[PDB]
Each structure stands twice: as structure tokens, then as C-alpha cells.
Ligand binder design. Structure first.
Ligand SMILES: O=C(O)C1c2ccccc2Oc2ccccc21
Ligand SMILES: O=C(O)C1c2ccccc2Oc2ccccc21
Ligand SMILES: O=C(O)C1c2ccccc2Oc2ccccc21
Ligand SMILES: O=C(O)C1c2ccccc2Oc2ccccc21
Lengths: 344, 344, 344, 344
């Protein structure tokens, strides 16, 4: 049996991990058990006060996020996508399966880390994006998982097959729209409903967003050419969803680009290549662990266009974490993870 | 095995029935098969062109809605919440399980039917709201189910325990907000995104809405008093969800009303009574078959207040249909029906 | 000339007052001048950092909210709809025209005030709802204005003509949906976009909302019958707008009720009575100072239904303040206040 | 006095033209009169049945769109952004001021027109984007105006100063999010509220969108180089607003690019260059004729980034039409056109 703790249970990523665990077949047959649920504030409150959608766990008392509380759990989700978990991870029993939703163990270049995060690089753990070349093998039986960022998940799935096949130039452009749950649950004026509803805005533009080097790192793993990444995130008035529009120069026939996506994804159950003449929409993947992808060539502009839609909280965060957890535990990789969206 | 057809498969209710069937344990172990998917238009198209979220069924070819196509199935969902199924249903065998999402077999008073629907009364089938007193008995082993309207589902769950215990007056007021998927998929200018987004409006007010007599009928069934119903629906800029605010005069203490709701709902798997101090929200029930209910007493106004939140497409439509299906077939009532919402 | 200060300039009400002042004909011809803009935090920031829509004032430096900063202004808007301005108002020069967006000077019953607000009653100032009987005369040349709450504005406009004519019973029910800007700009988890989008919820139900006695007070001014108010507010995923559904028992002919609304509003430029067969929508009044009102009778339920739509930030807050300011200064009452909404 | 007709009055662009005319100073002092309001359907209905926000015109009777009805007016708005006005415009006098919101007279290359629109090229009229180099000269005293498309307006304001100064490469990438009112009022299933709310999707990708050659044409006019345009539009769940993210390779320093934008826009009343450290948002420009623009350089990616926010219905359509009208008639260009957004 695997007893699971969720640190940061009261945030959006933590609530979504718990939603997926409650629906997981190992929860139903007793193999997966939900233990301590912790938060940095509001210890002593009940979970229902934070996540009224999780009624089977409503009565659970939130505990402080402390190593002692997290002891005795075979797996610990560090559900702080915008936090720094290196210090807490060091405090846990090292045989624990530690699944970090944050960034501390994602990057593999210490100088890049220090430039973008302002601290000493902690190192890296197996990246929880099983569809990326070579990634699945590193996750089988791992006791450490670095969950990818939500935007890099969409951009890498959209772009890596074309670049791996050397069919596009290695200077890529990504403009990705995101619902606001990706910002997490910390209350700020700029994330208030009145501000977000009816409005769209780019933010952290022109290379300052910390997911820029994460996209570059994933792409550099499938090519030896010099990769550059122009990444612009755009907040839109939705709660969930990322639609990444990804471009690069190309002079390759569309059919050869489509063949590269076929080769990458034909046997990947969470990656859906759109039928000819269809394009992804985030509405179709909400609540699912799926990515819907379409590709095209703008011949006049000599530009490849790849569109990818994911649910930022599922395939971009908690679904990635659970998918990687399945691989870590030797369980069927698709367990608990639907490809069917909740639409409209 | 139970071979199931879905007529009206390309509409919202039909797509949500299919989502639930795809996740149903009887589909997973082969006891339930998804057969013919039909529509009144676009026969020959594929389901993926209508429901991109249902990728496991994307290649299914939509067939014409005809009694011949629907014969040879053990169960038939008539997934036309705004259609009139009487003529088609009369062509199907009494032994075929028919689950009608439309209104034709909901009402038990022919004169009321004629007044509000302007046609001859087709009859009455067991009402697919298993939590109503006596309803579960009528559904077990039925081959006929009339699924309730979405607004009546919310209003009846909010009000029937108080009224059945004679703890409120039988003159009730319901003001219910709803997302736009309740209107179905028929394109009209009043339901365009640009019109609906950022706007709220009441419609079909002051007793002309056809769900008014349906609420009255369900409430009359739990009391011996003349029931009157003031029902105002309000369209809001959401795709799913109904939040029903329901009021009635009372002279009874809150403690007695609370006890009546506990007694009615403590063992009901889909009905969640909010802990004291918490109130329902539609976000918490989206994608689930749950209803979240809270009750209160306005002492100064001598008024009972009951709030109910449901997903209009699940507990208000397709989830009720599948729940009643489970009962009709002798399967565990909760099969395929989660109480956990997809939030935020 | 009238030099105007706005205290609380960085909140939503303060930003909307400034929007209306910038468009006011007295600003254009030099008679109205915009002076100090203050806030409790962020003094030294520029206004553009808080209200990027107010580009003509973007460079203004926010000053601390202090009596000394507000001196030398002929009119001071206390744009703190959820604050308590009695202490600051006492510090201003008493000949100043003081326009309080908060509640401290709205209520006329000290015991009611203490019950709902937990403090000693400060008194009352002329209520800034000029269409209410007797209200306009108290605002002409006043140096004090208590701006109404947003929900009472909608409910009182919907209900007072029927009650004044004694055509409905004095026990009224109000269920009002509101966009989230009415909560103000203080960051809380429950007002975050991810939480608000796609969700609706009632709050402060069963008589605990402080606008309940404000509605009762306005209605008691048009009748000597004992008034009771059941008031339920519902948050919906819009930034602006209140749609109030208001009911009461009646046995009066609809035509007599319509005549009462005609008598009240035929000469009121901001009150639009819907043509027969039309119903209000908040989308149609956004950005305008208008209220759109329809009335009906549910004969089966013996219930009067009145629907009122306003923009909560204009007719429900800042437009009420500017309308009352015009009356205070002896300026045309409609100056700077459009009846045309910004739709879709 | 200038008697104005609006053909297509019942659509979104027509309603927004009428909103602006109602607030125009020439309407207030009688120099502009609103004459015939026409549509291709529902002649005989009243305007209030189409545009409930335009209550001062609610009683106007919609007339058939015919050259006879439109004659006898000094100015005619053809408010059909997706219509083809060539045949109707050829029936009107050269001395009548015609302002076409549609595309028929925008393009200057007949072969490009035939390729993208599949019809004979009707000709070219002065392009209604007064801020483009040389455009104001062409509009003064014209009797013919082709209003720009909404996406080209945003992309050209974002990009032309950099390209005209030869500070970026002439291969540009535009990814622009838009609210749904840009689609007009024609009811289709893909534009239903339930579909659009909570979803984002790219459409008409990889060079098939008809605004691609329009962007290319406007950019070609400021440079001597071959221009290529990769343009991806993305529909988001808002009613109004376009946020264009525009990129191009560059070797020029940020200081030089910033200076070029200051030089181009410092005296342009509707173009607001964001203070350093601020970025545009569509919420800040809704209901205004303003464009908010920020520029940046991604040094690692050697990429220039320009962000532009407009209201698609004002600066992208009806505001551009009225602005160009003012120029054609010799009225102050800013008459009736505020730069202040209606936010939140
Ligand atoms: O961009 C990010 O890294 C992340 C985010 C992700 C998706 C959408 C919005 C969003 O905003 C914030 C705000 C604070 C901290 C992190 C984020
Ligand atoms: O009210 C209804 O009966 C139903 C509906 C339900 C929820 C939300 C909107 C809505 O609108 C329409 C429109 C056409 C036909 C039926 C409906
Ligand atoms: O209800 C209110 O009095 C007011 C409010 C008005 C409209 C919409 C939401 C809303 O929520 C809050 C939250 C905090 C303080 C005041 C409010
Ligand atoms: O893209 C366009 O040309 C235009 C449009 C503009 C903004 C947003 C959506 C939108 O969709 C449609 C649909 C039909 C016809 C034109 C459009």
C-alpha cells in the first residue's frame, strides 16, 4: 500500500491532486490511502473550508506543513507550484517518493537557475513529462519527481516533434493564453475576479518569465542546434486551460511535419492529434489529462504553427504529478487519468 | 450486456450522457456497450465534429434518429431536453429501457400539460429524481424514466424536506441562476457568447416558465396543501451550474428545520448538507452528480431560506438519467457518478 | 469653481467616480477641477499603477488619506463603500460638500445601526437616491450626501412604486445577482478570478446582510404598514451589474401596478420602464447611470414580480454620487451621466 | 446639418456607431442628425428589440437596407464588418460620405483580394486608420472611408513604428486574442455562450485568415522590404477586446526602439505608450477609442515584442469609423471619442 501526504493541500494544485487521488482506482481498491493534508496557514481548519468540491474529505483537519507531520507517508506531494521545496524535501525521510510541483528540481543548468531564480541551484530530479523523449524511462521506479511547469508542458508537446526531426528552425516563438488558476491561490489585486473578468493581458514578457529557460531546456534535449525561445504568457478570463500557439520558421512540407507528430504520439494515450481540419480548444480538455494538438504550415510566411491545448491544472500540474506517480510506483500509467474533457 | 443508444447524441445532454457512460464501470468491464448515436441533422458526420471532448468516440458516425436505428438496443436515452419524445417513444418496445430527458412524460395532470405545452398529454413515466420520497421505489426495475427538468431538480431538493415536515408555508418563491448550457445547442442570437458574457437577465417570469408546474407537482406530492410557486430563472455568464435560492414563510425554529434536512439527506449519497456556516456554490459541484444544500431562517422576515447548487448538465440532466438507469437495471445507484466537483 | 478630492481613489468606486468626473461637462469647461487623490496605502505611487483606464490622470501621485491633504477642496468624495468615514468626515472643514460612499450616514435608526454594524450610530445625511419620494428635495444644495448601497438602489427602485400605491403586501423578497466589483478591491481568496469565474453563490443570507435594513428603511418611507425584507445576494461571474428579482404577494391587476410605475418614473430620466414583452438585462445598462425595470403579476402564485437592472458601480455607487453632487451644486442633474449602456 | 444613415443598424458594429453618435457633441448641438436605420432582416421592428442599451433610439423603426432609403443622407455608415458593400456603395453618390466597416475597399492589390475573398476587386478607399503614416492626409475631406479590420488595427499600431524605422526584421508574428463580438451577431453553434465561456481556441490559422494580407499591406506601406506575416487569432471568453502580441527579430537596442515609438505616438491622442514597467490590458480600453501599447526586447532571443490592447468594437471598428468621419467632415478628430476605459 502507498500512503500519500499532500503538503500545500489548500492551494489549487493540492486540491486537484486530491481530486485525482479520490478518483484513482488504487484509492477505490485500498492500495492508495490519503494521509496528512497540510498548509502553511489555517492549520486546524477543515479541508471543506478550502475545497468545498472535495466533500469526501471535507472533515479532514488541515495540519501544519512540517516534516514531522509528513513522516510515515510513502509518497509526499509538495503541492506548491510557486514555492521552493528544497528545504522541506531535505527534511523528509529520503526513501519517500517526493513529488515536487514547484521548480526547485526542474532545471539542469546551475547558471541558468541562478539567473532566473536568484538562488543557488539545488540540482534536478526526473522531469514529470513522460511523453518527452527519454523521460518515461527516468520515471519508472523513481523516488523523485519534478513536475513540469504548466506553460512548458504545452509548448514542449507542441514543438518537440518538429524540432527533433530537424524540420523547423530552432528559434521558436510561443504565445500561450492561460486561465487564472495557474497563478495559484494567493490573493492579489491583479488576480481578483473583477480585474480578470472581461480582460486579457500579457505579463512577464520578453524573456523575463521563468518558464522561458524551462522550454529551452526541454527543446535542447531533442536537438544539438542552438535553441532560442520567445515566450509570451497571456492571462484570459477563464479559470482553467492553456492554449499555446507555437511557431518557428520552416521550409518543410506539412506532410513531413505531420509524420513527425505521428511518430512521436501515435502510441501516447494522453496526446490527441486533431483530425484534419480540426483545431484544439481548451474547453475540450478541461478536467482531462489530455493534450490536443494540431499542426500547420503557413507557406507564405514560411512558418510552422503548432497549437496545443491542455488543462493547466491536470496535464499541466496535478495530472502530470499523478501520471508520474503511477510510473514511480509501477502502476498502469493511465490509472486515474481520463482523456475525456468536461465540456461545455 | 446492455447495448445503449443515445438519440440526440450531438447535443449537450447527449454529450454529457456519453461522457458519463465512457467513465461508467459497466463500460469498463463490458457489461454496457455504446451503440447507435443519432441526431435529427448531420447524419453521416462523425461525433468528433460535435463533441471534441469525447475523443474515444470521435470516429463514431452519427445516424438518423429513427425508431429502426434505435431498435435492437436494450436501453435508449432520448437526449433531447427540449424535444418532444412521445411519438418516437410510442414506436419502441415496452421492454426497452427508455430514458427521456425531455418533458413529455414528466407531468401527471393532462390539463396542466395542455396549458403549458399546447399539445395532447402523452402520459406519465416514473420521475427520475430518486431522492424524492417514494421515487426510488418507482424507478427500481422500471423500463420508463422521465428525467426531471434542471430547475425543478434544484428547487425540489432545496424545499421538499421542509414542506414534507410541514415546517414552511406551501407558497414558495424560487429565484434560480443558471449557466447557458441549459438552453441546449440551438443557435439563437440571445444565447450568443457576446450577449451572454458580462450580463444577467431574468426570463419567462411570473409563471410562464414551463418548469413552474413541474416544481408545483413535485411539491404537491409531499404535502396535502395547495402549493403555489413563484419561479424566476436568471441566465448568468457561466456554461454550467444552477444556484436555486428558495424561500417560504415559516414559524418553525431553525433547529427543527435543520433536523428535517438531516433526517431526509443523511444517507443520500449525492446530497451534501453544508456544515453550519458554509453555503453552496455551483463551482463546487461542476462535473459531479452532487447537490449542495444549506438552510437558514430569517427571523425578522419569518422566512425560511434554502440554497441548492447543482450542475445543470449532471444532477440536473445526464447524471440524473444515468442514476435512474442504474436503478432501473439493478446496478449500484452510484456507478459512474462522482460527488467530487471539478473546481476551480 | 468646484475643486474635488477623491479619498480612496485607488479602489473601484474611486476609479469610477474619476471616470465620471473626467467625462463631466463641468470638467470640460473648467468649472469642476480634480484635486487630491488619496489612499490608505501606496502613497507615492502613480494613479496609472492602480487605474490604467484613467490615462488622462495616469501621472497623478497618490497621496495619503489625511485631512490635511484633503483641505482646500470644495467637495470630497469618501470613496470607501465598505469603510467607516465618520472619523475622517469629522476632520474636514465642515463647509465642504462631503459625499460618503460608505454606510455610516445612511441609516436613520440607531438601534438598527448598532445591531448590524456593532458601533454607535453616527447619524444620517441626505440619501443619494434622487428618485425615491422626497429624496431629491433634500439633496438640492446639500453639503452632505450618503450614497446608497448598490443592492438597496436596485431593490428600492424595483419595489417602492408598488408599495407606495398599497398594491402589494409589505413582506417583500429580494434575490439579487451582482458582479464582483461590488465587493471592492481588497484581495481575498473568495474574490479571486479562478474562484469567481464559472461559479455562483449566495452569501450573507437570511437577514445577516447589512443591506437588508437599508432596503427596509427605504420602503418604510413610502408606507405606514409593517415592512419585512427577505434579501439574498448572489455573486455571479461578471465584473459589473446587479439584477434584482423582487417579489411580494398581490391581488391587484397588473394594469394598476403598471400605472404606479408610470406615475413614479415617467419623468425620471434615469429610470427606463421596459416596453411590454421586454425584460431588463444588466448588459444593457453597464457604463450607464440607468435602471431598467419591468413588472409582472404571477396570477397563479398571487405574486408581484419586479425586475431591476443597474450597473452597480454607476447607478449603484459612483453615478449616484455624481448625480447627487450635481443636485448639491445646483447643476443639471443629468450632467455627466449617460443613460446609454456599453453593450455587448 | 449632417444627416447620417446607418445600414446594418441591428448588428454590433451598427449599435456601437449609434452609441458613439448619441454621445457625439455634434448630436448634442444639432449639427449631426441620426436618420435612417436599416437592416437586411426584421424591417418594421423597433431598434429597442435589437439594442436595448440604446434607449434614446428604442422607438426607431428599422427600415430595409436599400439605396433609396440611404439616399438623402449626407453620410452613410455601412455597418456590416462581414458584409460586402461594393454593390450598394456603387448606387450612392460620390458626394455622400460613405464609411464602410466591411472589407470591400480595404485592399489595394486586386490579385490578393481575389485570392482571399473569391470575388472581383471593387477598388480601394482611404484606409480609416489615421495614425498610420500618411493616412490622416488621405482622410481629410474624403467622401470615402474603408474602416480597418479589428485585428489589423491592433497589429499595425503595435508594429509599424519599429518597421518604419527599420529597427526590426520584416518577418512578423502576431498572436492576437479577441472577444467574441468581433464575430458579429450571426448565430452559429461555435459562437454560443456555452461553447465560448471557459474556452480558448485558435482559428483560421497558418495564413488562411483574411486579415493576414491586410496586416501585410499596412506594413508594406512603411517599408521597402518584403513583409511576411504569421497571424494567429485566438477566441477567448470575453465580449470585447483585442490583445495583440507581436514579435519580430531585431538587432536594435531597446532604447532606440522605445525612442521610435515615442516619436511616432507622443502627439497621437488615442495611442497611449505604457510607462516603463507597465503592460497593456484590454480591460483598460473597453468602451474607449484608445490603444495601449508597450514594447520590449528579448535579448536572449534577439526578438522585439510589442503588445497592443484595443476595444475591437471601438478603435477596432466603430470608433475608427467615427474618428475618420470627424476627419472627413473637418470636425475635431477626437469629438465623441473618449480615451478613458470603462473598467473594471
Ligand atoms: O506565470 C506564472 O508563472 C504563474 C501563472 C501561471 C498561469 C497563469 C497565471 C500565472 O500568474 C502567476 C502569478 C504568481 C505566481 C505565478 C504565476
Ligand atoms: O429555461 C429553459 O427552459 C431552458 C434553459 C435552461 C437553463 C438556462 C437557459 C435556458 O434557456 C432555454 C432556451 C430555450 C429552450 C429552453 C431553455
Ligand atoms: O455584499 C456586500 O456588501 C459587498 C458586495 C457587493 C456586491 C458584490 C459582492 C460583495 O461582496 C462584499 C465583500 C466584502 C465587503 C462587501 C461586499
Ligand atoms: O475573425 C474574424 O474574421 C471575425 C472575428 C473577429 C473577432 C473574434 C471572432 C471572430 O469570428 C468571426 C466569425 C465569422 C466572421 C468573422 C469573424
Amino acid at each position: 500500500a502507498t500512503k500519500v501526504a499532500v503538503a500545500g493541500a489548500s492551494g489549487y494544485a493540492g486540491g486537484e491532486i486530491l481530486r485525482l487521488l479520490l478518483g484513482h482506482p488504487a484509492y477505490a481498491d485500498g492500495r492508495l490511502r490519503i494521509g496528512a493534508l497540510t498548509a502553511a496557514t489555517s492549520a486546524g481548519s477543515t479541508l471543506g473550508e478550502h475545497h468545498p468540491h472535495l466533500t469526501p474529505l471535507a472533515h479532514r483537519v488541515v495540519e501544519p506543513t512540517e516534516a514531522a507531520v509528513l513522516g510515515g507517508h510513502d509518497a509526499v506531494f509538495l503541492a506548491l507550484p510557486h514555492g521552493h521545496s528544497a528545504v522541506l524535501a531535505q527534511q523528509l525521510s529520503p526513501e519517500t517518493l517526493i513529488i515536487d510541483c514547484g521548480a526547485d528540481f526542474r532545471l539542469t543548468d546551475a547558471a541558468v537557475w541562478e539567473r532566473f531564480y536568484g538562488s543557488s541551484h539545488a540540482g534536478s530530479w526526473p522531469y514529470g513529462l513522460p511523453e518527452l523523449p527519454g523521460a518515461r524511462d527516468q520515471l519508472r521506479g523513481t523516488r523523485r519527481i519534478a513536475v513540469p511547469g504548466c506553460y512548458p508542458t504545452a509548448a514542449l508537446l507542441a514543438l518537440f516533434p518538429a524540432l527533433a526531426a530537424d524540420l523547423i528552425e530552432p528559434a521558436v516563438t510561443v504565445v500561450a493564453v492561460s486561465g487564472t488558476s495557474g497563478a495559484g491561490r494567493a490573493a492579489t489585486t491583479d488576480l481578483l475576479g473583477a480585474e480578470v473578468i472581461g480582460s486579457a493581458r500579457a505579463y512577464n514578457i520578453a524573456g523575463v518569465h521563468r518558464h522561458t529557460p524551462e522550454i529551452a531546456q526541454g527543446l535542447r534535449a531533442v536537438t544539438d542546434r542552438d535553441v532560442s525561445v520567445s515566450f509570451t504568457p497571456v492571462l484570459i478570463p477563464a479559470s482553467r486551460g492553456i492554449l499555446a500557439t507555437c511557431t518557428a520558421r520552416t521550409r518543410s512540407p506539412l506532410s513531413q511535419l505531420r509524420a513527425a507528430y505521428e511518430k512521436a504520439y501515435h502510441a501516447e494515450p494522453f496526446i490527441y492529434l486533431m483530425p484534419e481540419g480540426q483545431l484544439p480548444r481548451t474547453g475540450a480538455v478541461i478536467g482531462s489529462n489530455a493534450a490536443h494538438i494540431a499542426v500547420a504550415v503557413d507557406e507564405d510566411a514560411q512558418t510552422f504553427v503548432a497549437i496545443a491545448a491542455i488543462d493547466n491544472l491536470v496535464k499541466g500540474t496535478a495530472g502530470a504529478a499523478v501520471q508520474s506517480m503511477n510510473l514511480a510506483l509501477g502502476w498502469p500509467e493511465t490509472d486515474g487519468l481520463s482523456v475525456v474533457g468536461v465540456a461545455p
